[PDB]
Amino acid sequence: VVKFDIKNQCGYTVWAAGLPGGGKRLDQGQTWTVNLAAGTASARFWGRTGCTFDASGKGSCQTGDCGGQLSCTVSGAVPATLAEYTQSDQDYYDVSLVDGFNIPLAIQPTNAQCTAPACKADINAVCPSELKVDGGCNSACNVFKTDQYCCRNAYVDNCPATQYSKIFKNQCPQAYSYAKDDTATFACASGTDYSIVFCPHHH
Ligand SMILES: [Cl-]
Ligand SMILES: [Cl-]
Q: What share of the chain is helix, strand, coil (3-state, %, to 5)?
A: 15, 35, 50
87 contacts 190 by C-beta, under 8 angstroms: yes
Neighbours of 50 (CB within 10 A): 17
How many CB atoms within 10 Å of residue 162?
16
Residue 154 CA to ligand 1 center (angstroms) comes to: 44
* DSSP 3-state of 43: strand
CA distance 154 to 72: 34
Cis geometry, peptide bond prior to residue 128 (ω within 30 degrees of 0): no
Ligand whose nearest atom lies closest to the CA of 198:
2
Q: Which ligand is nearest to the CA of 201?
A: 2
Technique that determined the structure = X-ray
Residues 16, 70: Cα–Cα separation, whole Å: 9
Cα dihedral 44/59/141/104 (nearest 10): -60
CA of 100 to the centre of ligand 1 (A): 26
Pairing mode, strands 194-198 and 2-8:
parallel
Cα(36) to centroid(ligand 1), Å: 13
Q: At 64, which helix (H) or strand (E)? A: none
Domain count for the chain, please give it. Answer: 1
SS3 call for 187: strand
Phi and psi, residue 175, nearest 5°: -95, 155
DSSP string computed for 74-121: SPPPSP--EEEEEESSSEEEEEE-TT-BSS-EEEEESSTTS---EE-S
C-alpha span between 104 and 110 (Å, rounded): 20
Structural domain span for residue 84: 1-203
Ligand in nearest proximity to the CA of 200: 2
| Cα(80) to centroid(ligand 2), Å | 19
The residues near 134 (Cβ < 8 Å, ≥ 6 apart) are 50, 62, 63
